[PDB]
Amino acid sequence: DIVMTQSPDSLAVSLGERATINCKSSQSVLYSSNNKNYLAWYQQKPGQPPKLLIYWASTRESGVPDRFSGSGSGTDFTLTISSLQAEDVAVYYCQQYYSTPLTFGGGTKVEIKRTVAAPSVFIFPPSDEQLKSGTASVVCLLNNFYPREAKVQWKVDNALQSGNSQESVTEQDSKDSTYSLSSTLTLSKADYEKHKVYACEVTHQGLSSPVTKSFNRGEC
Amino acid sequence: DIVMTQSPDSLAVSLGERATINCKSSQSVLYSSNNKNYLAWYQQKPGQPPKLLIYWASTRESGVPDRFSGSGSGTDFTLTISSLQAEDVAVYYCQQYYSTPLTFGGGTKVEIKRTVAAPSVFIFPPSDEQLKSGTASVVCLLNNFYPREAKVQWKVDNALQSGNSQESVTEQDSKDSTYSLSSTLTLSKADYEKHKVYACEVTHQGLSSPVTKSFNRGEC
Amino acid sequence: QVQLVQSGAEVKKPGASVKVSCKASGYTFTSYDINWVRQATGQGLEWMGWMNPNSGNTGYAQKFQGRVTMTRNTSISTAYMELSSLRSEDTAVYYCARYIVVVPAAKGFDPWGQGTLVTVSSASTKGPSVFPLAPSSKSTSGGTAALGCLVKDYFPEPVTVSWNSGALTSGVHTFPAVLQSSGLYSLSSVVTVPSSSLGTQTYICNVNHKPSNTKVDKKVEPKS
Amino acid sequence: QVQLVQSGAEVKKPGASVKVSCKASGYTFTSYDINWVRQATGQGLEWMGWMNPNSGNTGYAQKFQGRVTMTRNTSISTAYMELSSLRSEDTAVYYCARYIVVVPAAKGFDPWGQGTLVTVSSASTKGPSVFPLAPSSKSTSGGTAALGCLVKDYFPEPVTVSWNSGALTSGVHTFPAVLQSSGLYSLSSVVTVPSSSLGTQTYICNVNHKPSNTKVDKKVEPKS
Amino acid sequence: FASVYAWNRKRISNCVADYSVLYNSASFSTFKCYGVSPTKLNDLCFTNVYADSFVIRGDEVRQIAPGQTGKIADYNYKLPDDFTGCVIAWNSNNLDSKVGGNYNYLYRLFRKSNLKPFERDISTEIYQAGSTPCNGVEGFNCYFPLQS
Ligand SMILES: *[C@@H]1O[C@H](CO)[C@@H](O[C@@H]2O[C@H](CO)[C@@H](O[C@@H]3O[C@H](CO)[C@@H](O)[C@H](O)[C@H]3NC(C)=O)[C@H](O)[C@H]2NC(C)=O)[C@H](O)[C@H]1NC(C)=O
Ligand SMILES: *[C@@H]1O[C@H](CO)[C@@H](O[C@@H]2O[C@H](CO)[C@@H](O[C@@H]3O[C@H](CO)[C@@H](O)[C@H](O)[C@H]3NC(C)=O)[C@H](O)[C@H]2NC(C)=O)[C@H](O)[C@H]1NC(C)=O
């Protein structure tokens, strides 16, 4: 019933900033004079169980320094961490209380100062061992890069390839706050041996025009 | 060793706003119970020596009104001037303390309300006196304009000219918060007399498509 | 002390059943309600609270009904959960939390289980196939060039690839494993190294598969 | 009073040496360390603190070593700085500050020198060459049109151009001087004026070069 | 006279004290009495009189009073908050000031903690401002504690 729609997402902003995460549905003021609220804030480190932050919506932090700081009203509220610092990079959920279930989604990373930067791109042809097995993986790597909103277009003999690739992306880097991405194109040996140029065209804000790394099957 | 990387730059925002300038490296909490900090904030007016602002990171302003207001932690912190007002337009550095050197960089200007505006453009051919001397300066002026991220492309007979121009830009104007830019193209008399159309093509956010001002050498 | 201990990171086949345990300590046990949550790969949570210290009627989340059963033991205070008729998309991680209260009204969950793993899929278990992705000029740019190892087609999710027995920590980045339509996982770990050092030093990826006992070292060298 | 007085805005040739002075007042002098900083054209700062009231061992910034020497006099409390073997890219402005302290730990620099100028380059000194940039229809747009004066090729950095002996303050904007590869500066100052007033009134740029003694008035009129 | 950071301390004792020759001498620029107004001094008897002596600037005579702050009253010479005696002060430009500067009159300008009343501190340890041990050598955030 009560949906906790949270608006902002990926607030990758320079440390120290003041994030403002809003969410609301279907008030839970809870009578009984206990006019407080009904929902906690949470922090879950990646690869970790969650933790507890501000509860009652009432700034009630426990073993938690002051920069993490809540607020509250009847339906709407916000967590609003101040003077953010390294290692606050997490995912921040909400609650519901007497409701039933929960709902929330948020997080951050970095921003840097220099230009929008750009990825190092690299394309890897399939190893000779794999072509024996009867399948060809064609990997394309995008190294270090802030804007994760990168596009990887595979092309085979200049035909844009749809539906035989998979990507994954790393967590924001704790040192240089960048992201790295690996896209894998999977073909059969038979179908691999039917075309020549394998290309990987990367689009990104730090590139003025897209970068293509490519090889020619069977050319040492 | 300790690098004070400051993320934000040119916060040209409407007066009264609340800027948030972050920087950090390699904590200087400084033991001895004196758990305070170790770094001041600075303000340097253009064409002036610097001044002192918040120190210890501890809001400790001296002959300085409250709107300028610091914060602090172990590694990360922020200056966070409130209700900004005219004449706070400066460059704002950081410190290091026991470290050794310093590091910081920041500033602001304006924003306005109306559209992104646009420059008045004007191209000036070389004066007859200078062509006697044996050199031709071709000046192109861009008058009043907020977004300073303007592009000046010189073209000579429709050939984009690279590496014989110089620009300079004025400080944000204290009245209308605009910027003005002058680009000078320098040629020899001999090379000047080898071409006809001299053009200056300005790109800018307040222009829907770029503006070219041009003259034809030798046409009264 | 205030703790919660889960156990049972395991693998099942679809159309089966599983029981998961949460061991508690440092409390009276029968005094705070146990609540479990689901969590997919990079998603939200669910499962409403239920169960109580004494007897406890127990609740549900109304789309998980019938398959869900909650049993505990007053011999040490260890809550469990029995899921049944698994459909190979309930593969997730599952948690525990104490849901502590205080005079007015309880404030969020006290502790937080360590989580567990349940992987459903008709795959059983398979070992990884490894290829070296050679450093190349298409990967080379100026001062640095990247090389790596592709470890693919394995079911038993926890797999690790190190570089030079754990030596290189610069540029080494293992990307999240990908789950194919075949039902098996795959991943690739890549590291950049100065382009002056293409073949010069040792770059051997050490592949270890812990559910199985696979251990293979593969050297990556520039293309022939 | 709390003051710092610098002197010596000057010009040098590369491969030479310079001494710069900071005069203090309103204090015991030998009680607060003098610290100098560099500042290029629109850049950051550097130079770590050093020197002390009594004797003072003096420090350095470890890329400025050998060339740097710090000498003072207990006759009035005036700290100096001797740089040597100038390389025509150390041209910058140089500051002084008292670095005041208070019980716990000193808080930033007390005062702040007025700064000084050192310009290194085999140019010696040269006078400006002036041209008038005429108002034109390519500069004209609707109600206003712009005209100006181009003053170029001079070494001795401080140069000024006014409009009509200081009369027009509307639209008059002098742009930062530019340093060419030849080693000489150049700039252009422009002002807009209603297009109904192209030639009507007086628009004479007054060029004054203070290191030399150049004073020339140039009239700007629409193109022939 | 005696420095300001090591003041003297004479313990006047059983005697016949005539504070009138003091009170009316008109040579004193400052004669404030706190516990007891001046004219009634030549009509009372105590157990001990102490007399402390030193030399300061001209405009630091307002920190020699009960309940003040500043570099002198903080850590050079602190007066308790229920003082009883009197404070006397007079200008001495011709005796103590000499052409070229009389650098023999020092004062302490750094201390860990303000003095207890009538407490005295003649040590000369290097003031460690920074966490970095001074090791007994000067430098940034390691200052000699006496000025002149
Ligand atoms: C939940 O609580 C139960 C008690 O209520 C625990 O139960 C008992 O566990 C014993 C093992 O520790 C079993 O032991 C022996 O079992 C063998 C083989 O079945 C018999 O031959 C022995 O006679 C028997 N000995 C004794 C004295 O028990 C018990 O059979 C078993 N009995 C009960 C009371 O259930 C559970 O172990 C406990 N489980 C958890 C997860 O906490
Ligand atoms: C740093 O302190 C120095 C003292 O330690 C100052 O030194 C003295 O400066 C005098 C000029 O004001 C010189 O004066 C006269 O010089 C002429 C020509 O050399 C002689 O014929 C005279 O005999 C001499 N007269 C006297 C009485 O000095 C002094 O020669 C000179 N002597 C000393 C003590 O060094 C410096 O001026 C001062 N500098 C700064 C920048 O503060």
Author numbering:
A (entry chain K), B (entry chain N): 1 to 220
C (entry chain H), D (entry chain J): 1 to 224
E (entry chain C): 347 to 494
How do the authors describe this structure?
RBD, which directly binds to ACE2 receptor, is a major target for development of the therapeutic nAbs against COVID-19. To further explore the interactions between nAbs and S proteins, we solved cryo-electron microscopy (cryo-EM) structures of the S protein in complex with ten nAbs, in full-length IgG-form or in both IgG-form and Fab-form. Bivalent binding was revealed for the full-length form nAbs, which showed that the full-length form exhibits different binding mode and induces more RBDs to the “up” conformation than the Fab-form that is monovalent.
The structures are labeled according to the number of RBD bound with nAb as mono (1 RBD), double (2 RBDs) or triple (3 RBDs) binding, respectively.
